[PDB]
Motif scaffolding. Structure first.
Motif, PDB file in Angstrom:
ATOM      1  N   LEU F 106      56.911  49.472  23.860  1.00  0.00           N
ATOM      2  CA  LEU F 106      57.285  50.014  25.796  1.00  0.00           C
ATOM      3  C   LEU F 106      57.481  48.905  26.047  1.00  0.00           C
ATOM      4  O   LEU F 106      58.159  48.242  26.960  1.00  0.00           O
ATOM      5  CB  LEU F 106      56.037  51.043  26.114  1.00  0.00           C
ATOM      6  N   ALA F 107      56.551  47.617  25.977  1.00  0.00           N
ATOM      7  CA  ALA F 107      56.712  46.316  26.792  1.00  0.00           C
ATOM      8  C   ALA F 107      58.052  45.758  26.583  1.00  0.00           C
ATOM      9  O   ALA F 107      58.531  45.431  26.928  1.00  0.00           O
ATOM     10  CB  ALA F 107      55.278  45.318  26.575  1.00  0.00           C
ATOM     11  N   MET F 108      58.366  46.051  25.055  1.00  0.00           N
ATOM     12  CA  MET F 108      59.821  45.414  25.099  1.00  0.00           C
ATOM     13  C   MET F 108      60.869  45.823  25.249  1.00  0.00           C
ATOM     14  O   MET F 108      61.855  45.461  25.778  1.00  0.00           O
ATOM     15  CB  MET F 108      60.285  45.172  23.596  1.00  0.00           C
ATOM     16  N   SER F 110      60.780  47.915  28.463  1.00  0.00           N
ATOM     17  CA  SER F 110      60.821  47.493  30.147  1.00  0.00           C
ATOM     18  C   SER F 110      60.646  45.805  30.565  1.00  0.00           C
ATOM     19  O   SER F 110      61.512  45.497  31.392  1.00  0.00           O
ATOM     20  CB  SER F 110      59.180  47.456  30.454  1.00  0.00           C
ATOM     21  N   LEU F 111      61.236  45.382  28.814  1.00  0.00           N
ATOM     22  CA  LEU F 111      62.242  43.923  29.464  1.00  0.00           C
ATOM     23  C   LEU F 111      63.619  43.468  29.035  1.00  0.00           C
ATOM     24  O   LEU F 111      64.036  43.134  29.984  1.00  0.00           O
ATOM     25  CB  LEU F 111      61.594  42.587  28.709  1.00  0.00           C
ATOM     26  N   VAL F 113      65.269  46.123  30.875  1.00  0.00           N
ATOM     27  CA  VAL F 113      66.680  46.018  31.711  1.00  0.00           C
ATOM     28  C   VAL F 113      66.487  44.485  32.789  1.00  0.00           C
ATOM     29  O   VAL F 113      67.543  45.005  33.432  1.00  0.00           O
ATOM     30  CB  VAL F 113      65.763  46.521  33.174  1.00  0.00           C
ATOM     31  N   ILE F 140      64.702  52.037  34.984  1.00  0.00           N
ATOM     32  CA  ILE F 140      63.441  52.117  34.782  1.00  0.00           C
ATOM     33  C   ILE F 140      62.322  53.925  35.214  1.00  0.00           C
ATOM     34  O   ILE F 140      61.190  53.997  35.022  1.00  0.00           O
ATOM     35  CB  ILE F 140      62.832  51.286  35.892  1.00  0.00           C
TER      36      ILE F 140
END
Ligand SMILES: CCCCCCCCCCCCCCCCCC(=O)OC[C@H](COP(=O)([O-])OCC(O)COP(=O)([O-])OC[C@@H](COC(=O)CCCCCCCCCCCCCCCCC)OC(=O)CCCCCCCCCCCCCCCCC)OC(=O)CCCCCCCCCCCCCCCCC
Ligand SMILES: CCCCCCCCCCCCCCCCCC(=O)OC[C@H](COP(=O)([O-])OCC(O)COP(=O)([O-])OC[C@@H](COC(=O)CCCCCCCCCCCCCCCCC)OC(=O)CCCCCCCCCCCCCCCCC)OC(=O)CCCCCCCCCCCCCCCCC
Ligand SMILES: CCCCCCCCCCCCCCCCCC(=O)OC[C@H](COP(=O)([O-])OCC[N+](C)(C)C)OC(=O)CCCCCCCCCCCCCCCCC
Ligand SMILES: CCCCCCCCCCCCCCCCCC(=O)OC[C@H](COP(=O)([O-])OCC[N+](C)(C)C)OC(=O)CCCCCCCCCCCCCCCCC
Ligand SMILES: CCCCCCCCCCCCCCCCCC(=O)OC[C@H](COP(=O)(O)OCCN)OC(=O)CCCCCCCCCCCCCCCCC
Ligand SMILES: CCCCCCCCCCCCCCCCCC(=O)OC[C@H](COP(=O)(O)OCCN)OC(=O)CCCCCCCCCCCCCCCCC
Ligand SMILES: CCCCCCCCCCCCCCCCCC(=O)OC[C@H](COP(=O)(O)OCCN)OC(=O)CCCCCCCCCCCCCCCCC
Ligand SMILES: CCCCCCCCCCCCCCCCCC(=O)OC[C@H](COP(=O)(O)OCCN)OC(=O)CCCCCCCCCCCCCCCCC
Ligand SMILES: CCCCCCCCCCCCCCCCCC(=O)OC[C@H](COP(=O)(O)OCCN)OC(=O)CCCCCCCCCCCCCCCCC
Ligand SMILES: CCCCCCCCCCCCCCCCCC(=O)OC[C@H](COP(=O)(O)OCCN)OC(=O)CCCCCCCCCCCCCCCCC
Lengths: 83, 98, 347, 70, 98, 318, 115, 96, 175
Positions: F106-108, F110-111, F113, F140
Motif C-alpha cells: 500500500l505504501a509503495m 501511494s508514492l 501518484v 488517491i
C-alpha cells in the motif's frame, strides 16, 4: 404498512446500493449481541498463551492449582477441541 | 488535573498511559520498570517539595536508566584508554574480543 | 452557517478547553488545544471577507507554531522523566519551551502582535470568545506547572505585557483593538501573581472575563466597532451609555467598583513575599489602561457628540438583539467589592 | 486464428514463472536443501541465532541432532 | 543522550528557525511546519521504542493524525488567501494593523 | 546469491511487460475481428523488440520551459516503485519476506501518484497539468477502497504477511466468502492502474491530454513499462488475495505454475474489459467511488470486523 | 541489508535507462520543436491553469478518510484481545463516524461536480 | 469454511506456543550464563586496560542501588568485533 | 561502517531539513520534505518500529504530502523560481550545512558535545536492549491496545477528524 411497503420498494428500485449498505451495516451491530458463539471468541483469545505461565510457590493450601501440567486440575481446553 | 473529574466519577480517561510501570498489554515490562516503581513509591503522598530532596537517590537511578548518561561516560573511558594502548602498544585484544 | 453546525462547532471549542482541564496526560492536553484551534477558525471565517481570512491565517500560524513548541516540551519531559503526567516539568528546557508556548497562546508580550490584528478582523462575537474563553485553557496548564516555571521568565513576560498593553492602547480608535490591548495588559497581572498565589490568578481571570464579556455584549447591542460609532449611543439608548461608564470605570480598577478587587488582592500577595517594587510598578503602569478607558467615557457618556439626521429613524425601533446575561454581568462587574472575601471559594 | 495468440501468451507465462522458480531453487541452494528460515518475531530470531552458535560453523541451516549429544 | 538524538533535535531547531523566518511563500512556511511534526514523530518514537513503553506506541500515530488534520486546515486557509489576491504571498496579508 | 535473485526477478518482469503489449494487441485484435501483429517476427513475436529499439533511438524531446529535474525524476520514480512492489510477493517464497508485506505494498503504491503529479507539473503545459490533477484525484480516491477492502480481507487472514494468505486459503479460496470485496477490489485495481473504462487520461477523444503527452522516445517507454508492471503486480496481488494456491513445500514449482496461470487470466481480463465497454466521465468514476463503493465498502468492513467474532472464527496472530 | 540492496538495484536500473535514453539518440532541437504541444494552435492567454475548488476538496476529503484509515489498520491485531466487547464497540464507532463524514459531504453537495 | 479452518489454526497456534513454553526455561537458563560470562569477560579486560588511571574502581556500578540492572548492548559487547555486534543489534531488524 | 546506519540516516535527515527549511520554491521544498520523510522512516525502523515507520510512508508521504504537492501545483504559481533564490536560500543552505558539519565533526572526534544538552558519540547501538524471546511485536501489541485501552483517545480523535471535515467545508464554501 403502506409507508413500509412503498418506502421500502421505492428505495429498493432507486438506491439498491445504499439499501444493501444499511442492511449489512445493521447486521454487523446486531448479530454479535445475539450470537451464541460470541462467548467462544473471548475464551479462545484468553486461552492462547503468549507469556510464560509463571509458577506459584506451593504454600500447602492451593488444592485448585495443579502440581504438574498433566494433572487433572486447572483449566481444561476440552471445550476447544470439540469446537 | 485542573478539574479532577476522573477521580470524582471513578473513570479512567487517560491515567493508563501516564507512566511506564502501569498495566501494559500482555504484561510486557519496560526497560526501566523497576526504577520507576521505586521512585513513584518513594515520593507517594509526601508532596513534590519533599520529593525533590527525600527521594533524590531513587530519581537519580531512574534518570540513569532512562538516559544512561553515566554508563556511556564510563564506556567512553574504557574505549579511550584501550585505544590509547594500541599505538603506544602495550595491550592486545584477546581471542574472544576479535 | 447552519444553526446546528454553529452549535456543533461551539461545543467543540468548549469540549477542547474542557479536555485540557480534566486531563492528566500531556497528550490529551495537546489534543484539546488542537481540537480547540480546529473549531475556532470557522467562527472567525464566518463573514467571508478578506480581513477575516487574514485574521485566521495569522491566528492559525501563531497557534500552530505554539502547539509544536508545546509538543517539544512534552517529549523533552518524557525523555528525562519517562511519564506524561500533567504536573511540574522535569527539565529546565521543557519549562522554557512550554512557558513561551503558553505565552504565545495567551498573547503575552513580546509574543503579542497577533492579538490586536486578529481581533480587529473578526466579528465582535468571535472576538469575545478569542479574548475571554480562549484564555481558560492556557491558564489551566500554567496553574499546574507553576512550580517549574523560571521566575524571571514569567515575571518578565508579565511586566512587558502591562507595558505593551497600556502603551499600545493609547493610540487606538477601534473598539476591537482597544479591547485587544486591554486584554494584553490584564494578562500581565494574572501571570505576575502566579508564582506566589495561583488562586489570585483565577480570581483576576474570573473578573476579567465578566468585565470583558460585559463590554463586548454592550458593543454588540448597538453594533458599534469604532469610537465615533459608539459616541452616537447617547442619542439612541442612553441607558447603555451609563453601563459602559460603570463598566469602563471598573476595568480601570477604580474603587468601589469590582475591577479593583484583583488589583487589590495581587498587591497583597506580592507584598507578603517582600516584593514591593514590582507591584508598585504594575499598579502605576496600569494608569495607562485607565486613561484610554476614560477617553471612551468622555466620547460615550460624559459628553454629547454630534449626532446625525438619519438617527431620527432609529428611535422608532427597539433593540431586538439578545443581550444575554447583560443585566446580570453588569452588576457583577460593578457591585461586588463588598463580597471580596468570597474569593476563598476558588482555593 | 485464435490459437496464434498462445505463442505470445506462452512467452509471457514463462517469464512470470522464472521469478518464483529462481527464488525457490536459490533458497534451497543457500540453506542446505531446506527452506530459508522465516523469523517474523524475536523468539524465532533467538533460536536462529542459537542454531548459528550451536553449529560449530557460523551457519544457521546446519542442524545437529542427537549425534551431537553426550 | 546519543548521537541520533543530537540530529533529531538539531532537525527540529532547523525547521523552527525556518518557520520563524518567512521568505515570501505561505506554502513554504507550512512545509517547515510539517517538518516540525516529522522531527517530533521521530523523537517520540525513538524514546518510546527504546524504552519499551508499550502503550505509548500509539502516541506517535495520534500525533500524526492531528498534525495532518491541522495541515489540512492550514492548506484550506492558504487556498482561500490565493483566491483573494491570486497568490499565497504573505506580504498581501497586511490589511490589519495598517 | 541474493544479487542474482534480484536479477532473476527484475529481468523477467520487463520481458513479461514486453510481451504483454503483444498479447494485448493480439487479444484485442481478435475480439475486433482483426489479426494483430503477425508480420514482425512469426506471430508478432518480435514486435516488442522492434518497438523497444525504435523508442530508445528516437529523439527525447523535453520543452525548453520545463523543469528538467522533475521531468527526469518522474520516469525514475514510476519505474523504480513498479519493480519495488514485487519483492514482497510470495511465489510461493518472496524475495524479501516481510512481516508487514501487505502494508508495504500500500505504501509503495501511494508514492506512485507523485510520478503523475511530477510528470504534468514539469511540463508547463496547461493541458498536461489538467490531466495530472484529474489523474491524481482519481488515483488517491480509489486508494481509499483498496486500503479498506484489503483490511477487511486481512480480518479473515490474521496479519499483514503476504505468505499467510496462502495459509488462510488452504481449504478454500477467499473469493467465495468475499466475492463482494473481490468485485470492488478488481475494479479498484482497474482505476488505480488507469485502465479502461477508467482511462480518461489516455482518452484523447474526451478533449483531454494525458499527463504522458509531453514525453517521447525512451522516457515514454519507462512510463509505459511501469504502468504494465503495475497491471501484472495488481493481478498477482488479486490472485494471492482472493484465489489462493496450495503450497507443497517439496514441489514449489507446482504452486508457481498454478499461481502464474491465475495471474495471466486475471491479467487477460483487463484486455477483455478494455475491448467491451465505453469510458466513464470523470465525475461518473468519482461517484462510482464516493457514492457506491465506499458506502458499501464501509458496510462490509464493519461486517468483517464482527463476523469473525460472532462466528468464533478469529484467525491467529502469528 | 537485502532490502536496502533491492531498492538500490531497482532505482539504479531505472536511472541507467534514463541516461541511456537521453544520450543515445541523435538530437536536433529548434524553437518550435521545444514548445509545449498545445493542440496545434498558439496558446490563448499567458496565465497558468486557474485554481479549482472542487479538486481541493476531494484531495482534502481523501486525506481525512486516509487518516481514519490509519486508525483502522491495527484492527487485525486488536481482535486478539480479551476485551472483545470494547474493541468491537470502538471499531464500529470509528467506521460509523467515518460513514457520518461521508454522509455530511454527500448531503451538503460536497461530492458534486456541477458547479 | 473459514470459521472452522480459522478455529483449527487457533488450536495449531496454541500447540506452537506450548512448545515455546516448554523450552523457555532452558533458553532462559543459558541466556543468563551467556550474559554473565560476557560481563566477566569485560570486567577482566577492564582491569588490565584501566590500571594506571587514578581513582578508577574496576567494576564500580553507576547505580546507587545494588539491585541487578539488565545491561544495555554497549556494556555486553563493549570490547568486541563489529560483525558480532551488528547481528546482535541489527540482525533481527534487517532479516528480510 | 554499517553499524552507524542510524547516525548516517540522521545526518541525511538533518540535511533534508536544511533543504526545505531554507525555503526554496514550494516545488523543491516538498521534494526535500519527501526525502527527509523517507529517511525518518529509516531511523524508526532501525529502532524496531515497523508499523510506525510504514505509517510515515503510507500517511505522511502517500497522504499528507501528496495533498501538499497537489495543492502546491494548483494553489501556487512559479515566478522566477530556482534554488538560486535571491541569495537568501544559497546562504541559508551553507549556514545549515556548515552548522551540521561542525556538530558531526565534534561528535565523531571528541565523542561528546554539549549544546543545550549533553550528547554522546559512542554510537546509537550502545543503548539498545539486550533482547527477549517474545512471540509478538511489542510496537504492534501497543497499537492494538488503542481499541482495548484507549477508548477515550478514539472518541476525541474520531470526533476531531469528523469536525475537521465539517470545518473545512465551511471555510472553503465562500458563502
Ligand atoms: C462567569 C460568568 C460570565 C458568563 C458569561 C456569559 C455571557 C455570554 C455573552 C453572550 C453575549 C451574546 O449575546 O451572545 C452573542 C454571541 C453570538 O454572536 P452573534 O453575532 O450574535 O451570532 C452568532 C451566529 O453567527 C448567529 O447565527 P444565528 O442567529 O442564525 O444562530 C446562532 C444561535 C446559536 O445558539 C447558541 O449560541 C448556542 C450556544 C450554546 C453553547 C453551549 C452552552 C453551554 C450548555 C451546553 O443563536 C445564538 O447565537 C445565541 C446567542 C448566544 C448565547 C450564548 C450564551 C451562552 C454562552 C455562555 C456560556 C459559556 C460558554 O454569542 C457568542 O457566541 C459568544 C460566546 C460567549 C463566550 C464568552 C466566554 C464566557 C466564559 C464563561 C466561563
Ligand atoms: C443556577 C441556579 C439558579 C437557576 C436560575 C433559574 C433562571 C434561569 C433561567 C431564566 C431564563 O429563562 O433565561 C436565562 C438565560 C438568560 O436570559 P436573559 O435574557 O439574560 O434573562 C433576562 C431576560 O429579561 C429574560 O426575560 P424573559 O421574560 O424572556 O424570561 C423570563 C424568565 C425569567 O427571567 C429572568 O429573570 C431570568 C434571570 C435569572 C437570573 C439571572 C440569569 C441567571 C444567572 C443567575 C446566577 C447567579 C448569579 C451570580 C450570583 C451572585 C454571585 C455572588 O422566565 C423563565 O424563562 C422561566 C425560567 C426557566 C424555567 O437565557 C438563556 O439563554 C439560557 C436558557
Ligand atoms: C531509494 C529510495 C526509494 C524510495 C523509498 C522506498 C521505500 C524506502 C523505505 C524502505 C521500505 C520499508 O521501509 O519497508 C519496511 C520493511 C518492513 O519490514 P517488516 O516490519 O515486515 O519486518 C522486518 C523485520 N523482521 C522481518 C525481522 C520482522 O522493513 C524491512 O523489511 C527491512 C528493515 C528495514 C531496513 C532498511 C530500512 C532503512 C532503509 C529505508 C530508508 C532508505 C531511505 C528512503 C528515502 C526515500 C525518500 C523518498
Ligand atoms: C472477468 C474477470 C473474471 C475472469 C478471470 C478470472 C480468472 C481467475 C482464475 C480462475 C480459474 C482458476 C485458474 C484455473 C487454471 C489454473 C489451474 C488451477 O487453478 O489449479 C487447479 C485449481 C485447484 O485450486 P488451486 O490451483 O488454487 O490449488 C488448490 C488451492 N485450494 C485447495 C485452496 C483450492 O482448480 C481450478 O482452478 C479449477 C477451476
Ligand atoms: C553551543 C552552546 O553551548 O550554547 C548554546 C546556547 C547557550 O546554551 P548553553 O550551551 O547551555 O551555554 C553555553 C555553554 N557552552 O543555546 C542556544 O541558544 C543555541 C541555539 C539553540 C536554539 C534553540 C531554539 C529552540 C529549540 C529548542 C530545541 C532543543 C535544541 C537544542 C538541542 C539541539 C541543538 C543541536
Ligand atoms: C429492510 C431495511 C433495509 C435497509 C434500510 C433501507 C433504507 C436505507 C436507504 C435510505 C435511502 C435514503 C434516500 C436516499 O438515499 O436517496 C438517495 C440520495 C442520493 O441520491 P443523489 O446523490 O441525490 O442522486 C440523485 C440522482 N438522480 O441520498 C442522499 O441524498 C444522501 C444519502 C447518504 C446516505 C449514505 C451515506 C453512506 C452510509 C454508508 C453506510 C454505513 C452504514 C451506516 C452506519 C450505521 C449502521 C448501523
Ligand atoms: C447503534 C449504533 C449504530 C447506529 C449509529 C447511529 C447513526 C446512524 C447513521 C450513521 C450513518 C450515517 C447516515 C446518515 C444519512 C442519513 C440519511 C440521509 O441523510 O438521507 C438524506 C435524504 C436526502 O436525500 P435527497 O437527495 O435530498 O432526496 C431524498 C428524497 N427522498 O433524505 C432522506 O429521504 C433520507 C430518508 C431516511 C433514510 C434513513 C436511513 C437510515
Ligand atoms: C446522528 C446525527 C446525524 C448523523 C447524520 C448526519 C448526516 C448529514 C446530515 C446533514 O449534513 O444535513 C444537514 C443537517 C441538517 O440541516 P438541514 O436543514 O437538513 O440542511 C442544511 C442545508 N442548508 O445538519 C447537521 O449537520 C445535523 C447533524 C449534526 C451532527 C453531525 C455530526 C454527527 C453527530
Ligand atoms: C544550536 C545549534 C545550532 C542550530 C542552528 C539552527 C539554524 C541552522 C540554519 C537553518 C537554516 C534556516 C533557513 C534560514 C531562514 C530563512 O529562510 O531566512 C529568510 C530571510 C528572508 O528572506 P528574504 O525575503 O529574501 O529577505 C531578505 C532579502 N534581502 O532571509 C534573511 O533575512 C537572511 C537569511 C539568513 C539565513 C541564515 C540564518 C541562519 C539562522 C540564524 C539563527 C541561528 C539560531
Ligand atoms: C544573521 C543576520 C541576518 C541579516 C543578514 C542578511 C542581510 C540581508 O538582508 O541580505 C540578504 C542576503 C542577500 O540577499 P538579497 O540579494 O539582498 O535578496 C534580496 C531579496 N529581496 O542573503 C544572504 O546573504 C544570506 C544570509 C547571510 C548568511 C547568513 C549569515 C548569518 C549566519 C552566520
Amino acid at each position: 404498512a403502506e409507508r413500509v411497503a412503498a418506502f421500502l420498494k421505492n428505495v429498493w428500485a432507486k438506491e439498491p446500493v445504499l439499501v444493501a449498505s444499511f442492511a449489512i451495516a445493521g447486521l454487523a451491530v446486531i448479530l454479535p449481541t445475539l450470537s451464541p458463539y460470541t462467548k467462544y471468541s473471548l475464551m479462545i483469545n484468553r486461552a492462547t498463551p503468549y507469556n510464560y505461565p509463571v509458577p506459584l510457590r506451593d504454600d500447602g493450601n492451593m488444592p485448585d492449582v495443579p502440581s504438574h501440567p498433566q494433572d487433572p486440575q486447572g483449566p481444561s481446553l476440552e471445550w476447544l477441541k470439540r469446537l | 488535573p485542573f478539574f479532577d473529574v476522573q477521580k470524582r466519577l471513578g473513570v479512567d480517561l487517560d491515567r493508563w498511559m501516564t507512566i511506564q510501570s502501569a498495566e501494559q498489554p500482555h504484561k510486557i515490562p519496560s526497560r526501566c520498570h523497576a526504577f520507576e516503581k521505586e521512585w513513584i513509591e518513594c515520593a507517594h503522598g509526601i508532596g513534590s517539595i519533599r520529593a525533590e530532596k527525600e527521594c533524590k537517590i531513587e530519581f537519580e537511578d531512574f534518570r540513569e536508566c532512562l538516559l544512561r548518561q553515566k554508563t556511556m561516560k564510563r564506556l567512553h573511558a574504557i574505549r579511550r584508554q584501550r585505544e590509547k594502548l594500541i599505538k603506544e602498544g602495550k595491550y592486545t585484544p584477546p581471542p574472544h574480543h576479535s | 452557517m447552519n444553526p446546528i453546525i454553529f452549535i456543533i462547532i461551539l461545543l467543540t471549542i468548549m469540549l477542547g478547553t474542557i479536555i485540557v482541564m480534566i486531563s492528566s496526560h500531556w497528550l490529551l492536553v495537546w489534543i484539546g488545544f488542537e481540537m480547540n484551534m480546529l473549531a475556532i477558525i470557522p467562527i472567525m471565517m464566518k463573514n467571508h471577507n478578506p480581513r477575516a481570512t487574514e485574521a485566521s491565517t495569522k491566528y492559525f500560524l501563531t497557534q500552530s507554531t505554539a502547539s509544536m513548541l508545546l509538543m517539544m516540551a512534552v517529549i523533552i519531559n518524557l525523555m528525562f522523566s519517562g511519564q506524561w503526567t500533567v504536573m511540574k516539568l522535569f527539565n529546565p528546557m521543557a519549562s522554557m519551551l512550554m512557558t513561551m508556548a503558553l505565552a504565545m497562546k495567551l498573547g503575552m508580550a513580546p509574543f503579542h502582535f497577533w492579538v490586536p490584528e486578529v481581533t480587529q478582523g473578526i466579528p465582535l462575537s468571535s472576538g469575545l470568545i478569542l479574548l475571554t474563553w480562549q484564555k481558560l485553557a492556557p491558564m489551566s496548564v500554567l496553574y499546574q506547572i507553576f512550580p517549574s516555571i523560571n521566575l524571571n521568565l514569567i515575571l518578565t513576560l508579565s511586566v512587558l505585557s502591562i507595558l505593551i498593553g497600556g502603551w499600545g492602547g493609547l493610540n487606538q480608535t477601534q473598539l476591537r483593538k482597544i479591547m485587544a490591548y486591554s486584554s494584553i495588559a490584564h494578562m500581565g497581572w494574572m501571570t505576575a501573581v502566579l508564582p506566589y498565589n495561583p488562586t489570585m490568578t483565577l480570581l483576576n481571570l474570573i473578573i476579567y472575563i465578566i468585565m470583558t464579556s460585559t463590554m463586548f455584549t454592550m458593543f454588540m447591542a448597538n453594533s458599534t466597532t469604532t469610537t465615533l460609532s459608539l459616541s452616537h449611543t447617547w442619542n439612541k439608548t442612553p441607558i447603555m451609555t451609563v453601563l459602559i461608564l460603570a463598566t469602563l470605570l471598573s476595568m480601570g480598577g477604580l474603587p468601589p467598583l469590582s475591577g479593583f478587587m484583583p488589583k487589590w488582592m495581587i498587591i497583597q500577595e506580592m507584598t507578603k513575599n517582600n516584593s514591593i517594587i514590582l507591584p508598585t510598578f504594575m499598579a502605576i503602569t496600569a494608569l495607562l489602561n485607565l486613561y484610554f478607558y476614560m477617553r471612551l467615557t468622555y466620547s460615550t457618556t460624559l459628553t454629547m457628540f454630534p449626532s446625525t439626521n438619519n438617527m431620527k429613524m432609529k428611535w422608532q425601533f427597539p433593540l431586538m438583539k439578545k443581550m444575554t446575561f447583560l443585566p446580570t454581568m453588569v452588576v457583577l462587574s460593578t457591585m461586588m467589592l463588598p463580597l471580596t472575601p468570597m474569593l476563598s471559594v476558588l482555593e | 486464428m485464435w490459437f496464434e495468440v498462445l505463442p505470445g501468451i506462452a512467452v509471457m507465462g514463462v517469464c512470470l514463472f522464472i521469478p518464483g522458480m529462481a527464488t525457490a531453487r536459490i533458497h534451497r541452494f543457500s540453506n542446505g536443501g531446506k527452506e530459508k528460515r522465516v523469523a517474523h518475531y524475536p523468539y524465532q530470531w533467538y533460536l536462529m541465532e542459537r542454531d548459528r552458535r550451536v553449529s560449530g560453523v557460523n551457519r544457521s541451516y546446519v542442524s545437529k541432532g542427537l549425534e551431537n549429544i553426550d | 543522550m546519543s548521537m541520533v538524538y543530537m540530529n533529531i533535535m538539531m532537525a527540529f531547531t532547523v525547521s523552527l528557525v525556518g518557520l520563524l523566518m518567512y521568505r515570501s511563500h505561505l506554502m513554504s512556511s507550512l512545509l517547515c511546519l510539517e517538518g516540525m511534526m516529522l522531527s517530533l514523530f521521530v523523537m517520540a518514537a525513538l524514546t518510546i521504542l527504546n524504552s519499551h513503553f508499550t502503550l505509548a506506541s500509539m502516541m506517535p500515530i495520534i500525533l500524526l493524525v492531528f498534525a495532518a488534520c491541522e495541515a489540512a486546515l492550514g492548506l484550506s486557509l492558504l487556498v482561500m488567501v490565493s483566491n483573494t489576491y491570486g497568490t499565497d504571498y504573505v506580504q498581501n496579508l497586511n490589511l490589519l494593523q495598517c | 546469491m541474493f544479487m542474482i535473485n534480484i536479477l532473476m526477478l527484475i529481468i523477467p518482469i520487463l520481458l513479461a511487460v514486453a510481451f504483454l503489449t503483444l498479447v494485448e494487441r493480439k487479444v484485442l485484435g481478435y475480439m475486433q475481428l482483426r489479426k494483430g501483429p503477425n508480420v514482425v517476427g512469426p506471430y508478432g513475436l518480435l514486435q516488442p523488440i522492434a518497438d523497444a529499439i525504435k523508442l530508445f533511438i528516437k529523439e527525447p524531446l523535453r520543452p525548453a520551459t520545463s523543469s528538467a529535474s522533475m521531468f527526469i525524476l518522474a520516469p525514475i520514480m514510476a519505474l523504480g516503485l513498479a519493480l519495488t512492489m514485487w519483492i514482497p510477493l510470495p511465489m510461493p517464497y518472496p524475495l524479501i519476506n516481510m512481516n508487514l508485506g501487505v502494508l508495504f505494498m500500500l505504501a509503495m503504491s501511494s508514492l506512485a501518484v507523485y510520478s503523475i503529479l511530477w510528470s504534468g507539473w514539469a511540463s508547463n503545459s496547461k493541458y498536461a497539468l489538467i490531466g495530472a490533477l484529474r489523474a491524481v484525484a482519481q488515483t488517491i480516491s480509489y486508494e481509499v477502497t483498496l486500503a479498506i477492502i484489503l483490511l477487511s480481507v486481512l480480518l479473515m487472514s490474521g496479519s499483514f504477511t503476504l505468505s499467510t494468505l496462502i495459509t488462510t486459503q488452504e481449504q478454500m479460496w477467499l473469493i467465495l466468502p468475499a466475492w463482494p470485496l473481490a468485485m470492488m477490489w478488481f475494479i479498484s485495481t482497474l482505476a488505480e492502474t488507469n485502465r479502461a473504462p477508467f482511462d480518461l487520461t489516455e482518452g484523447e477523444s474526451e478533449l483531454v491530454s494525458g499527463f504522458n503527452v509531453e514525453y517521447a522516445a525512451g522516457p515514454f517507454a519507462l512510463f509505459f513499462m511501469a504502468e504494465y508492471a503495475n497491471i501484472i503486480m495488481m493481478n498477482i496481488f488479486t490472485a494471492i488475495l482472493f484465489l489462493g494456491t496450495s503450497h507443497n513445500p517439496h514441489m514449489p514449482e507446482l504452486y508457481t505454475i498454478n499461481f502464474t496461470i491465475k495471474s495471466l487470466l486475471l491479467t487477460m481480463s483487463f484486455l477483455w474489459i478494455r475491448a467491451s465497454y465505453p469510458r466513464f466521465r470523470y465525475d461518473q468514476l468519482m461517484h462510482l467511488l464516493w457514492k457506491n463503493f465506499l458506502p458499501l465498502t464501509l458496510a462490509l468492513c464493519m461486517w468483517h470486523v464482527s463476523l469473525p467474532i460472532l462466528t468464533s472464527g478469529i484467525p491467529p496472530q502469528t | 541489508m537485502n532490502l536496502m540492496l533491492a531498492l538500490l538495484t531497482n532505482f539504479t536500473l531505472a536511472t541507467l535507462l534514463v541516461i541511456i535514453a537521453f544520450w543515445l539518440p541523435q538530437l536536433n532541437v529548434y524553437s518550435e520543436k521545444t514548445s509545449p504541444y498545445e493542440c496545434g494552435f498558439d496558446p490563448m492567454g499567458s496565465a497558468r491553469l486557474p485554481f479549482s475548488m472542487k479538486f481541493f476538496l476531494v484531495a482534502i476529503t481523501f486525506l481525512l478518510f486516509d487518516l481514519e484509515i490509519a486508525l483502522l489498520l491495527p484492527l487485525p491485531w486488536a481482535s486478539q484481545t480479551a476485551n472483545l466487547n470494547t474493541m468491537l464497540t470502538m471499531a464500529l464507532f470509528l467506521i460509523i463516524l467515518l460513514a457520518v463524514s461521508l454522509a455530511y459531504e454527500w448531503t451538503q453537495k460536497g461530492l458534486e461536480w456541477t458547479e | 469454511s473459514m470459521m472452522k479452518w480459522n478455529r483449527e489454526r487457533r488450536r495449531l497456534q496454541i500447540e506452537d506456543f506450548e512448545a515455546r513454553i516448554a523450552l523457555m526455561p532452558l533458553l532462559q537458563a543459558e541466556k543468563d550464563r551467556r550474559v554473565l560470562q560476557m560481563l566477566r569477560e569485560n570486567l577482566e579486560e577492564e582491569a588490565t586496560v584501566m590500571k594506571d588511571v587514578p581513582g578508577w574502581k574496576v567494576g564500580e556500578s553507576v547505580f546507587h542501588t545494588t539491585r541487578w540492572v539488565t545491561p544495555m548492548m554497549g556494556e555486553l559487547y563493549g570490547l568486541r568485533a563489529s560483525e558480532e555486534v551488528l547481528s546482535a543489534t541489527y540482525g533481527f531488524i534487517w532479516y528480510t | 561502517m554499517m553499524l552507524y546506519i542510524v547516525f548516517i540516516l540522521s545526518v541525511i535527515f538533518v540535511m533534508g531539513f536544511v533543504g526545505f527549511s531554507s525555503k526554496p520554491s514550494p516545488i523543491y521544498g516538498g521534494l526535500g520534505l519527501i526525502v527527509s520523510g523517507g529517511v525518518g522512516c529509516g531511523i524508526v525502523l532501525n529502532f524496531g518500529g515497523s508499523f510506525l515507520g510504514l505509517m510515515v510512508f503510507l500517511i505522511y508521504l502517500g497522504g499528507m504530502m501528496v495533498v501538499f504537492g497537489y495543492t502546491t501545483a494548483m494553489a501556487t504559481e512559479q515566478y522566477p523560481e530556482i534554488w538560486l533564490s535571491n541569495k537568501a536560500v544559497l546562504g541559508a543552505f551553507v549556514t545549515g550545512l556548515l552548522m551540521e558539519f561542525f556538530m558531526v565533526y565534534y561528535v565523531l572526534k571528541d565523542k561528546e558535545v554539549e549544546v543545550v544538552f549533553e550528547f554522546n558519540g559512542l554510537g546509537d547501538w550502545v543503548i539498545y536492549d539486550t533482547g527477549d524471546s517474545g512471540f509478538f511485536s511489542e510496537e504492534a501489541m501497543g497499537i492494538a491496545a488503542l481499541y482495548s485501552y484507549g477508548t477515550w483517545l478514539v472518541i476525541v480523535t474520531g470526533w476531531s477528524l469528523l469536525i475537521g471535515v465539517v470545518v473545512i467545508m465551511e471555510i472553503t464554501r465562500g458563502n
